[PDB]
Amino acid sequence: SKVVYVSHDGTRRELDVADGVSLMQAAVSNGIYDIVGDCGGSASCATCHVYVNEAFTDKVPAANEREIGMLESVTAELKPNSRLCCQIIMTPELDGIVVDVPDRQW
């Protein structure tokens, strides 16, 4: 399914992500440099921060307690639609999901 990573300067980068693969994993393994994913996807860092387009925030499973806690430490502006994309697993329903990436993770 399709996923669009919009870098902070507006560049739209589309990737085909297989079901069950997290947005972070697909990102860091396909040149999406503005996403670090340092902890490896256990909601243990804030380096996979992204802003989920409001047309998809409802279809994504809500952030668990751990992510909520980690999000508090994001280095870029924390917004209502901020999410640690390693916590978002790709599924067909999410096809076309768009995420805007901040100008910094560290």
Query: Which residues of this chain interact with ligand FES, rule CB under 6 A?
Result: 24, 37-39, 41, 43-45, 47-48, 70, 84, 86
Q: Is 85 annotated as a binding residue?
A: no
10/87 with CB nearer ligand FES: 87
Q: Looking at beta carbons only, is 10 or 35 nearer to ligand FES?
A: 35
CB 6 within 8 A of CB 33: no
E-only strand ranges, the chain: 2-6, 12-16, 49-52, 82-84, 97-100
Q: Is 39 annotated as a binding residue?
A: yes
